[PDB]
């Protein structure tokens, strides 16, 4: 679970950095990490338009951010989990974090990181462990 938290922070930090934002400034607080970064890059490049849809259709504000996050993720996983959906999940949180900084709501960065790590640990971990853990992910997506 601490390794999962660290995976979430690695991904979010990477995605922020690609946009010129540092983790140390904007959060108030290894083979798997690399595979997830690459899968995230590939997913976002391949479906760029989906992420502009996200930032155009959903105007995040600190007061509605949690409810909106939970509604998206619950619908994403409504009928099950797979590796592709997990990648979409990480990319979604990455986009939310960058959007938050652009919009001067950077207090949400550490919150989104916490919501993702909670969801990952409580709801995604059971499936991930049942399917060969993250090393399997490295096999397919690394």
């Amino acid at each position: 679970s601490q390794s999962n938290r660290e995976l979430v922070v690695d991904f979010l930090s990477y995605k922020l950095s690609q946009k010129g934002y540092s983790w140390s400034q904007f959060s108030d607080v290894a083979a798997v990490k690399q595979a997830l970064r690459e899968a995230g890059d590939e997913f976002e490049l391949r479906y760029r338009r989906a992420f502009s849809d996200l930032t155009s259709q959903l105007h995040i504000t600190p007061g509605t951010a949690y409810q909106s996050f939970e509604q998206v993720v619950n619908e994403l996983f409504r009928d099950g989990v797979n590796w592709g959906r997990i990648v979409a999940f990480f990319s979604f949180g990455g986009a939310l974090c960058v959007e938050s900084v652009d919009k001067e709501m950077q207090v949400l960065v550490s919150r989104i990181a916490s919501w993702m790590a909670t969801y990952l640990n409580d709801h995604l971990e059971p499936w991930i462990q049942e399917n060969g853990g993250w090393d399997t992910f490295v096999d397919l997506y690394g």
Partner: peptide, 21 residues
């Protein structure tokens, strides 16, 4: 979100279908 989740889900599934063992 519903529509945003649907977009992400469908793309996650296409990604999954390609890479699944």
């Amino acid at each position: 979100x519903i529509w945003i989740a649907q977009e992400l889900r469908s793309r996650g599934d296409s990604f999954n279908a390609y890479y699944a063992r």
